[PDB]
Scaffold this active site. Structure first.
Site, PDB file in Angstrom:
ATOM      1  N   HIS A  12      39.768 -12.996  20.674  1.00 19.06           N
ATOM      2  CA  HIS A  12      39.290 -13.232  22.029  1.00 19.06           C
ATOM      3  C   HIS A  12      39.902 -14.400  22.759  1.00 19.06           C
ATOM      4  CE1 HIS A  12      36.371 -10.052  21.562  1.00 19.06           C
ATOM      5  NE2 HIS A  12      35.884 -10.639  20.483  1.00 19.06           N
ATOM      6  N   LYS A  41      40.876  -0.447  18.443  1.00 22.77           N
ATOM      7  CA  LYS A  41      39.631  -1.048  18.930  1.00 22.77           C
ATOM      8  C   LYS A  41      39.444  -0.600  20.393  1.00 22.77           C
ATOM      9  CE  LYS A  41      36.947  -5.311  19.251  1.00 22.77           C
ATOM     10  NZ  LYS A  41      36.896  -6.795  19.090  1.00 22.77           N
ATOM     11  N   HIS A 119      31.285 -14.246  18.500  1.00 27.73           N
ATOM     12  CA  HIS A 119      31.229 -12.873  19.018  1.00 27.73           C
ATOM     13  C   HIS A 119      31.316 -12.933  20.522  1.00 27.73           C
ATOM     14  CE1 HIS A 119      29.275  -8.965  20.010  1.00 27.73           C
ATOM     15  NE2 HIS A 119      28.425  -9.679  20.733  1.00 27.73           N
ATOM     16  N   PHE A 120      32.099 -12.026  21.086  1.00 34.61           N
ATOM     17  CA  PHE A 120      32.153 -11.861  22.522  1.00 34.61           C
ATOM     18  C   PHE A 120      31.174 -10.758  22.920  1.00 34.61           C
ATOM     19  CE2 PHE A 120      33.412 -10.697  26.714  1.00 34.61           C
ATOM     20  CZ  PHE A 120      33.915 -11.853  27.270  1.00 34.61           C
ATOM     21  N   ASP A 121      30.159 -11.095  23.730  1.00 33.55           N
ATOM     22  CA  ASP A 121      29.113 -10.116  24.060  1.00 33.55           C
ATOM     23  C   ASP A 121      29.335  -9.343  25.358  1.00 33.55           C
ATOM     24  OD1 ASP A 121      26.705  -9.100  22.736  1.00 33.55           O
ATOM     25  OD2 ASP A 121      25.573  -9.808  24.480  1.00 33.55           O
TER      26      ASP A 121
HETATM   27  O1  LIG Z   1      33.076  -6.996  27.457  1.00 34.20           O
HETATM   28  C1  LIG Z   1      33.232  -6.785  26.243  1.00 34.20           C
HETATM   29  C2  LIG Z   1      32.402  -5.936  25.499  1.00 34.20           C
HETATM   30  C3  LIG Z   1      32.629  -5.807  24.127  1.00 34.20           C
HETATM   31  N1  LIG Z   1      33.711  -6.418  23.538  1.00 34.20           N
HETATM   32  C4  LIG Z   1      34.039  -6.250  22.101  1.00 34.20           C
HETATM   33  O2  LIG Z   1      33.605  -4.975  21.640  1.00 34.20           O
HETATM   34  C5  LIG Z   1      32.905  -5.154  20.419  1.00 34.20           C
HETATM   35  C6  LIG Z   1      31.870  -4.053  20.224  1.00 34.20           C
HETATM   36  O3  LIG Z   1      30.683  -4.442  20.874  1.00 34.20           O
HETATM   37  P1  LIG Z   1      29.366  -4.876  20.046  1.00 34.20           P
HETATM   38  O4  LIG Z   1      29.729  -5.443  18.721  1.00 34.20           O
HETATM   39  O5  LIG Z   1      28.566  -5.872  20.796  1.00 34.20           O
HETATM   40  O6  LIG Z   1      28.538  -3.509  19.861  1.00 34.20           O
HETATM   41  P2  LIG Z   1      28.612  -2.323  20.948  1.00 34.20           P
HETATM   42  O7  LIG Z   1      28.796  -2.882  22.309  1.00 34.20           O
HETATM   43  O8  LIG Z   1      29.777  -1.459  20.632  1.00 34.20           O
HETATM   44  O9  LIG Z   1      27.350  -1.540  20.903  1.00 34.20           O
HETATM   45  C7  LIG Z   1      32.328  -6.567  20.549  1.00 34.20           C
HETATM   46  O10 LIG Z   1      31.924  -7.160  19.327  1.00 34.20           O
HETATM   47  C8  LIG Z   1      33.445  -7.328  21.204  1.00 34.20           C
HETATM   48  O11 LIG Z   1      34.406  -7.703  20.218  1.00 34.20           O
HETATM   49  C9  LIG Z   1      34.518  -7.247  24.261  1.00 34.20           C
HETATM   50  O12 LIG Z   1      35.444  -7.837  23.703  1.00 34.20           O
HETATM   51  N2  LIG Z   1      34.275  -7.427  25.605  1.00 34.20           N
HETATM   52  O1  LIG Z   2      24.780 -10.436  19.339  1.00 31.56           O
HETATM   53  C1  LIG Z   2      25.355 -10.882  18.356  1.00 31.56           C
HETATM   54  C2  LIG Z   2      26.329 -10.090  17.747  1.00 31.56           C
HETATM   55  C3  LIG Z   2      27.014 -10.604  16.658  1.00 31.56           C
HETATM   56  N1  LIG Z   2      26.676 -11.835  16.161  1.00 31.56           N
HETATM   57  C4  LIG Z   2      27.392 -12.408  15.008  1.00 31.56           C
HETATM   58  O2  LIG Z   2      28.743 -12.478  15.379  1.00 31.56           O
HETATM   59  C5  LIG Z   2      29.552 -12.468  14.221  1.00 31.56           C
HETATM   60  C6  LIG Z   2      30.734 -11.550  14.458  1.00 31.56           C
HETATM   61  O3  LIG Z   2      30.216 -10.278  14.748  1.00 31.56           O
HETATM   62  P1  LIG Z   2      30.845  -8.992  14.024  1.00 31.56           P
HETATM   63  O4  LIG Z   2      31.170  -9.269  12.606  1.00 31.56           O
HETATM   64  O5  LIG Z   2      29.918  -7.857  14.205  1.00 31.56           O
HETATM   65  O6  LIG Z   2      32.219  -8.778  14.846  1.00 31.56           O
HETATM   66  P2  LIG Z   2      32.294  -8.376  16.401  1.00 31.56           P
HETATM   67  O7  LIG Z   2      31.381  -7.245  16.691  1.00 31.56           O
HETATM   68  O8  LIG Z   2      31.913  -9.526  17.253  1.00 31.56           O
HETATM   69  O9  LIG Z   2      33.697  -7.934  16.607  1.00 31.56           O
HETATM   70  C7  LIG Z   2      28.681 -12.009  13.067  1.00 31.56           C
HETATM   71  O10 LIG Z   2      28.491 -13.111  12.196  1.00 31.56           O
HETATM   72  C8  LIG Z   2      27.354 -11.627  13.698  1.00 31.56           C
HETATM   73  O11 LIG Z   2      26.284 -12.072  12.890  1.00 31.56           O
HETATM   74  C9  LIG Z   2      25.726 -12.633  16.769  1.00 31.56           C
HETATM   75  O12 LIG Z   2      25.511 -13.756  16.300  1.00 31.56           O
HETATM   76  N2  LIG Z   2      25.043 -12.148  17.883  1.00 31.56           N
END
Ligand SMILES: O=c1ccn([C@@H]2O[C@H](COP(=O)(O)OP(=O)(O)O)[C@@H](O)[C@H]2O)c(=O)[nH]1
Ligand SMILES: O=c1ccn([C@@H]2O[C@H](COP(=O)(O)OP(=O)(O)O)[C@@H](O)[C@H]2O)c(=O)[nH]1
Length: 124
Positions: A12, A41, A119-121
């Site tokens: 990120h 991804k 983590h990027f949310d």
């Molecule tokens: O604006 C965004 C939204 C999502 N992600 C990435 O996409 C992954 C998948 O999202 P997440 O783990 O929160 O679960 P999901 O959104 O797929 O339900 C995240 O961890 C981020 O690494 C990102 O980079 N930018």
């Molecule tokens: O809403 C969230 C989502 C993820 N995590 C933490 O972020 C780290 C990285 O997340 P992950 O391994 O799922 O990878 P990502 O989805 O961000 O690519 C992990 O230690 C999770 O426990 C968190 O603290 N809050």
């Protein structure tokens, strides 16, 4: 082994450009950061701000994370970001992405001691 903090930086962080991000930016960046190695991804954001500025977000506005966890933080200022989103025609291993530059508030989850982004949310 790669720490959670280090993985966040690899996935990120891109402090080197202010935004520039050519239309080729995501195709190149997603591969080199090893986000296309095992699969394409689907969505990934890069942040074009200093590391210290992104780390500082962990002490900024506490907001709920998308998954319901409580450890997300929204930047008070907008930041230069690039969103990468896999195209309709992209087929692994030939991962293809649309590149979109924006200035938005970022939301990251923070963990650990020291308390740093892991983590990027979202961006808003
Ligand atoms: O604006 C965004 C939204 C999502 N992600 C990435 O996409 C992954 C998948 O999202 P997440 O783990 O929160 O679960 P999901 O959104 O797929 O339900 C995240 O961890 C981020 O690494 C990102 O980079 N930018
Ligand atoms: O809403 C969230 C989502 C993820 N995590 C933490 O972020 C780290 C990285 O997340 P992950 O391994 O799922 O990878 P990502 O989805 O961000 O690519 C992990 O230690 C999770 O426990 C968190 O603290 N809050």
């Amino acid at each position: 082994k790669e720490t959670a903090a280090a993985k966040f930086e690899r996935q990120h962080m891109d402090s080197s450009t202010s935004a520039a991000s050519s239309s080729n930016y995501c195709n190149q960046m997603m591969k080199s950061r090893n986000l296309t190695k095992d699969r394409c991804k689907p969505v990934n954001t890069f942040v074009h701000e200093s590391l210290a500025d992104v780390q500082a977000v962990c002490s900024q506005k506490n907001v709920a994370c998308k998954n319901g966890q409580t450890n997300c933080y929204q930047s008070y200022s907008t930041m230069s970001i690039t969103d990468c989103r896999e195209t309709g025609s992209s087929k692994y291993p030939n991962c293809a992405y649309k590149t979109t530059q924006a200035n938005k508030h970022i939301i990251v989850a923070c963990e650990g001691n020291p308390y740093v982004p892991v983590h990027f949310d979202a961006s808003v």
